[PDB]
Amino acid sequence: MKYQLTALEARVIGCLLEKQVTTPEQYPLSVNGVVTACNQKTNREPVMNLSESEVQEQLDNLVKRHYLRTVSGRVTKYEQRFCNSEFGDLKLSAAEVALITTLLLRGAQTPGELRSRAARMYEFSDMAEVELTLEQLANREDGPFVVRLAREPGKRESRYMHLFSGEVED
Template identity: 90%
Template sequence: MNLTEQEVQEQLDNLVKRHFLRTVSGFGNRVTKYEQRFCNSEFGDLKLSAAEVALVTTLLLRGAQTPGELRSRASRMHEFSDMTEVESTLERLASREDGPYVVRLAREPGKRESRYMHLFLRRRR
């Protein structure tokens, strides 16, 4: 993907306008910094638990993954007690009334576990 600086700035401005990002100012900042407002903000309806945020963020960054991969890769954001907690959190995300936010993919031939992927791209306005 090749984007010009102007194209990136236009998208950042659009995200700020839609309240998904906010600008962060600080003493001595030479460049504009941004902070995400993905969920749990006063401007949005999306409210997620810490476990749900960890899984969704990891899926957004890394793509479809197994519950085991998610537990390992999301551990800096949330410490899951066991695989059952990961799987129950994924099931909650898949069955939310305002969702679904994730989907379980069919198990690939030769693989032990099914993978999950996020469904946020299909939710564009």
């Protein structure tokens, strides 16, 4: 299937993808864990401050679309079913989850940025590996998940952006 997640659910999806790798002792996240992860001051562009009922609306919609699943602990925790599940067709490598997650949470970035900003979800040995992982995401037969943008002035690196939010222009 194809995705056009809004910027809110792309953030919620990115938060659960991030905490699953960086903090496995708190995964799966509860509703409060999703609220806190969305409103973080670091590694979040743009910095948001969502209501509790706001992400709950987004948690429930992503559940009905089967991108999330509810786990009962009375507290209800949420696990990501966006990739690397036992049924879903979307299978990502550890490097691909890192680049995709950092793109959903931080928007359009360049391979130089994605190397350091995704280093804790996947340590890239060289800046070629971040460059091959992004290309692979764009030449997959499952459709492209990554697009390259036009170079910005005075810089030798062109930015990349995920395609789970639909149309991309520049």
